[PDB]
Ligand SMILES: *[C@@H]1O[C@H](CO[C@@H]2O[C@@H](C)[C@@H](O)[C@@H](O)[C@@H]2O)[C@@H](O[C@@H]2O[C@H](CO)[C@@H](O[C@@H]3O[C@H](CO[C@H]4O[C@H](CO)[C@@H](O)[C@H](O)[C@@H]4O[C@@H]4O[C@H](CO)[C@@H](O)[C@H](O)[C@H]4NC(C)=O)[C@@H](O)[C@H](O[C@H]4O[C@H](CO)[C@@H](O)[C@H](O)[C@@H]4O[C@@H]4O[C@H](CO)[C@@H](O)[C@H](O)[C@H]4NC(C)=O)[C@@H]3O)[C@H](O)[C@H]2NC(C)=O)[C@H](O)[C@H]1NC(C)=O
């Protein structure tokens with residue numbers, strides 16, 4: 001048979017003014033001769049109807065893949081509303097409810113430190129810039145790098161890791177031409193998280 | 209019905225002289241009235257019999273959980289031998305083969321930089337020490353921290369992240385009493401990876 005998966009809004013969507021955060025009910029594994037599902041959504045059990053079943057797109061496993069999407073208020077998600085996606089299907093002898101909400105636990109304000117490349121790393125053509133972002137709850141957050149109010153292309157962020165004190169940390173690495181870090185050039189780590197002021201801070205980092 | 213999961217040896221096991229690296233065939237979801245499985249193992253298809261079905265231990269889902277374990281040569285794994293765990297079960301109308309070997313691709317020697325805590329982090333009681341370990345392949349690796357030839361207890365390592373250039377990176381964070389980092393005290397990041405010399409390097413980091 002099948003199995004149902006539920007996914008939460010994106011950090012940036014819920015912590016930014018004019019975005020469109022949404023929850024995404026992914027039904028995977030559907031049998032051809034019975035490929036019709038049926039979604040009924042609920043916010044805190046209260047049945048809401050901003051549904052959006054995006055018609056049934058195809059796959060490889062000789063099976064199938066139906067998906068709904070429910071737009072939702074940012075302050076809704078942040079205030080811990082529960083979002084029950086109720087799948088009703090013919091081929092199943094029972095629906096498959098799957099609830100999910102924000103993570104409860106006390107929010108925690110991330111500390112952000114930016115870290116210059118190790119003296120040794122100069123021997124290369126491109127150098128690494130490190131953003132440490134520790135001690136935060138819940139795990140949802142969003143990191144980004146820029147310079148001159150312009151995004152940077154070459155950075156990659158580790159996913160959050162459960163720290164020893166039940167909070168999270170993570171690093172985001174930025175890579176640049178060694179020439180740039182030298183000169184004087186200034187670069188910024190931007191973090192977006194619940195527990196932050198205006199949900200947003202930004203630490204710079206450069207050369208002395 | 210069920211589903212089968214296969215897991216590879218641990219990094220340290222295969223890159224260290226006298227360890228006992230093993231592959232672990234985890235059969236999850238077993239029916240009570242038909243809870244008997246059968247494993248037949250193969251190294252590169254050649255059937256080997258260092259099997260080890262650890263009798264069937266229990267669970268919660270009103271289902272079931274049978275497991276085998278096959279010891280194996282370190283240089284075997286590192287040389288890309290393929291390890292087919294063949295599950296034969298009654299309740300299934302077909303076995304469930306699941307192959308897995310080392311990751312193919314050209315091994316790549318990790319660069320290791322250690323990073324002191326950001327000037328601002330001194331306002332706290334405990335300080336963070338960073339190990340950057342980048343540009344390596346395959347993803348298997350093992351990090352560890354110590355001081356005075358003694359392990360440290362408070363560190364946590366991110367899992368490897370796919371970098372832009374098809375290699376991996378990761379950081380390992382070590383936490384210490386601010387008092388220690390000060391003094392003069394020296395700390396070491398220890399890395400164990402295929403592409404390394406003797407499969408092992410270790411960079412130190414301290415105060416000037
Ligand atoms: C054949 O049918 C389908 C078709 O899939 C096709 O074949 C497979 C093999 C792949 O090659 C596909 O590329 C290909 O299209 C197969 O369907 C798959 O089914 C498996 C399970 O049977 C699913 O694995 C799950 O993955 C989720 C999260 O995965 C995201 O990223 C995956 C890529 O790695 C991607 O596959 C998923 O679609 C999903 O996609 C994400 O979608 C959102 C949309 O906005 C996006 O933001 C993401 O970026 C996007 N990612 C991508 C790349 O698309 C994983 O979380 C599930 O496991 C969780 O839950 C399990 C318990 O239910 C638990 O055991 C796990 O440990 C894990 O637990 C989670 O842990 C963390 C907390 O730290 C957190 O993630 C969760 O909160 C927590 N969950 C819970 C509730 O505990 C799960 O493993 C795939 O989703 C699915 N593939 C696709 C594309 O849907 C299927 O394999 C075949 N049929 C079979 C079984 O024979």
Ligand SMILES: *[C@@H]1O[C@H](CO[C@@H]2O[C@@H](C)[C@@H](O)[C@@H](O)[C@@H]2O)[C@@H](O[C@@H]2O[C@H](CO)[C@@H](O[C@@H]3O[C@H](CO[C@H]4O[C@H](CO)[C@@H](O)[C@H](O)[C@@H]4O[C@@H]4O[C@H](CO)[C@@H](O)[C@H](O)[C@H]4NC(C)=O)[C@@H](O)[C@H](O[C@H]4O[C@H](CO)[C@@H](O)[C@H](O)[C@@H]4O[C@@H]4O[C@H](CO)[C@@H](O)[C@H](O)[C@H]4NC(C)=O)[C@@H]3O)[C@H](O)[C@H]2NC(C)=O)[C@H](O)[C@H]1NC(C)=O
Nearest residue numbers: 211213215216217218232234236237267268269270271272
């Ligand atoms: C009855 O209960 C048990 C309890 O399990 C869980 O318990 C509760 C608390 C919740 O978390 C529930 O989500 C869940 O019920 C269920 O047993 C579970 O079975 C599910 C699905 O059958 C498993 O999900 C998979 O997890 C594996 C990894 O599992 C390791 O790590 C887990 C968390 O980190 C841990 O819980 C496991 O114990 C296990 O631990 C490892 O064990 C070995 C043994 O020695 C050890 O050596 C390792 O060191 C150790 N790992 C460590 C360090 O933690 C994961 O691999 C699977 O994800 C891949 O496959 C999915 C297939 O569905 C796919 O959806 C994913 O996207 C993902 O994709 C893979 O990507 C890799 C990339 O390299 C690739 O190699 C694979 O080919 C590819 N696989 C694909 C696509 O198929 C998967 O998420 C649970 O782990 C397992 N739980 C336990 C306790 O074992 C059981 O299902 C329940 N009955 C039901 C629901 O019917």
